[PDB]
């Protein structure tokens, strides 16, 4: 609010507006989702890949009842896929919110439709993880999604869990104690990345991204004088670069698992380049 130009203030306001309209932070409208039921070299890697998703799951009913699901151990069989349909439904729900976020923003609406599609295919996973970070509780290792909770299982210990790049990302980013405004500028910087596959208006997207980055740098300078926030802008940009690498690693996991055991919803297939033809 302090020290920004009028264009920078309008930019933050437009992003905060889009975030408010399209982020169901209580997950009140996530419903009707599936739940876990009550050569060989490709299989060996798929087994390791699925370790990237292993969480337990709690559901608190409006009546006060609690269901809890603890996932199995890997015993060399199909039981390792039990959480995939639920995870697909959750990600699909998040992805719809992300697509709505982008479409409310003026700078995005003004790009040609092909570049909108390419930008969303490139960034949807990243914006999803940024939104999930805001409901991550780093004290209990839990993503608190309203009536749903997804909890990390104690291995090993805390430091042995933070070796997994996705978890180190979530814990390190939560430690920065970002404002809502800083999360939503992070989303814009990731969304308007000019080097995503298939982008045509590289120069326009690059100039938009740079403007979002300058606004973030200035927001931090004007509102965060404390020695703990020295280099905060550069810390955030380093997190964004690391998030891009996690996106490539986790996208290849999805594709290997999909090859052995189909689970991607139609929206996930569209976002991740699955044509529907073998
Ligand atoms: C295989 C696959 C790949 C991709 C690319 C997708 S996805 O982007 O479409 N979606 C998606 C959505 C949320 C995700 C996610 C993927 N990975 C994680 C990290 C899981 C936590 C570490 C476990 C620890 C064990 N060592 N989270 C966070 C999370 C937040 C809330 C609830 C649960 C998990 C999918 C579906 C599968």
């Amino acid at each position: 609010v302090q020290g920004l130009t009028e264009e920078q203030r309008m930019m933050i306001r437009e992003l905060m507006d889009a975030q408010m309209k399209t982020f169901d932070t209580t997950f009140s409208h996530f419903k009707n989702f599936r739940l876990p039921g009550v050569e060989a070299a490709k299989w060996s890697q798929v087994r390791k890949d699925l370790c990237s998703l292993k969480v337990s799951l709690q559901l608190r009913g409006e009546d006060g009842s609690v269901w809890n699901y603890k996932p199995p151990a890997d015993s060399g069989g199909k039981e390792i896929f039990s959480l995939l349909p639920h995870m697909a439904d959750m990600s699909t729900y998040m992805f719809k919110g992300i697509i709505s976020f982008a479409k409310v923003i003026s700078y995005f609406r003004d790009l040609p439709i092909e570049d909108q599609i390419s930008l969303l295919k490139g960034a949807a996973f990243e914006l999803c993880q940024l939104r999930f970070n805001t409901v991550f509780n780093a004290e209990t290792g839990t993503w608190e999604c309203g009536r749903l909770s997804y909890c990390l299982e104690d291995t090993g210990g805390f430091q042995q869990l933070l070796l997994e790049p996705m978890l180190k990302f979530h814990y390190m980013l939560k430690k920065l104690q970002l404002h809502e405004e800083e999360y939503v500028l992070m989303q814009a910087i990731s969304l308007f990345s000019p080097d995503r596959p298939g982008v045509l208006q590289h120069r326009v997207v690059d100039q938009l991204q740079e403007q979002f980055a300058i606004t973030l740098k200035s927001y931090i300078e004007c509102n965060r004088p404390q020695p703990a926030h020295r280099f905060l802008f550069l810390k955030i940009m380093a997190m964004l670069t690391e998030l891009r690498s996690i996106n490539a690693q986790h996208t290849q996991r999805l594709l290997r698992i999909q090859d052995i055991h189909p689970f991607a919803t139609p929206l996930m297939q569209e976002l991740f380049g699955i044509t529907g033809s073998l």
Side-chain angles (χ1 to χ4, degrees), residues 3-6 8-12 14-30 32-37 40-46 49-51 53-61 63-69 71-74 76-77 79-95 97-112 114-146 148-153 156-157 163-167 169-174 176-202 204-206 208-277:
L4 302 162
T5 71
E6 182 63 28
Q8 296 175 325
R9 275 197 269 87
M10 288 303 102
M11 179 176 283
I12 293 174
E14 180 167 19
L15 295 178
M16 288 297 287
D17 188 55
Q19 184 87 310
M20 174 271 294
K21 293 172 171 167
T22 64
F23 191 178
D24 182 13
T25 59
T26 66
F27 294 75
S28 291
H29 298 296
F30 177 44
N32 308 141
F33 44 75
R34 301 166 275 173
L35 288 178
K42 310 226 300 215
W43 277 83
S44 158
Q45 181 61 45
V46 154
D49 292 339
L50 281 165
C51 296
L53 284 188
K54 201 174 203 236
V55 300
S56 78
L57 183 164
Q58 175 172 124
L59 303 106
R60 291 168 297 291
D63 54 32
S65 57
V66 185
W67 277 105
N68 283 272
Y69 177 84
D74 184 355
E79 68 281 0
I80 63 183
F81 304 120
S82 45
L83 272 169
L84 285 179
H86 178 80
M87 290 309 299
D89 289 342
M90 168 57 94
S91 306
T92 298
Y93 183 78
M94 295 296 283
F95 285 152
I98 296 309
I99 295 168
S100 302
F101 172 77
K103 283 160 165 180
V104 158
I105 298 166
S106 60
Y107 316 92
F108 185 86
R109 276 202 318 265
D110 293 342
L111 296 166
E114 297 79 29
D115 277 359
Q116 298 182 25
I117 286 150
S118 294
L119 285 182
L120 285 167
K121 287 184 191 176
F125 170 84
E126 296 177 18
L127 272 74
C128 181
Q129 290 313 304
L130 292 165
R131 283 189 168 183
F132 275 135
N133 193 250
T134 70
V135 303
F136 183 63
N137 180 333
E139 288 70 73
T140 71
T142 300
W143 292 271
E144 303 181 338
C145 304
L148 291 170
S149 294
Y150 305 85
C151 191
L152 297 165
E153 292 157 292
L163 294 170
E164 172 56 51
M166 167 74 78
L167 291 186
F169 171 82
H170 275 288
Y171 276 98
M172 285 185 61
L173 180 54
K174 195 80 193 191
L176 296 183
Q177 293 180 249
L178 292 192
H179 297 175
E180 301 277 11
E181 291 81 354
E182 290 158 343
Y183 278 103
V184 81
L185 282 158
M186 283 181 72
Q187 288 173 206
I189 295 167
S190 166
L191 179 57
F192 294 86
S193 297
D195 38 23
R196 308 287 202 189
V199 178
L200 297 190
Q201 301 289 296
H202 175 280
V204 175
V205 179
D206 186 78
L208 284 168
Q209 185 189 57
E210 176 184 22
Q211 291 314 313
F212 289 127
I214 291 165
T215 299
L216 175 63
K217 181 171 184 315
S218 311
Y219 177 93
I220 289 169
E221 293 184 4
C222 302
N223 296 128
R224 291 180 167 276
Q226 296 80 3
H229 306 126
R230 280 175 73 184
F231 314 117
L232 178 58
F233 172 68
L234 291 177
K235 285 181 192 187
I236 289 172
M237 298 300 291
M239 294 306 282
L240 282 174
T241 291
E242 167 71 0
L243 182 49
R244 186 156 187 165
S245 154
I246 295 176
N247 176 8
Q249 274 152 18
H250 220 52
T251 291
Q252 291 302 305
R253 287 174 189 117
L254 185 147
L255 288 183
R256 290 191 291 267
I257 294 157
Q258 176 78 4
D259 189 70
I260 299 319
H261 185 273
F263 74 101
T265 63
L267 182 53
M268 294 169 58
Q269 291 171 235
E270 185 73 33
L271 289 168
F272 287 97
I274 297 169
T275 70
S277 190

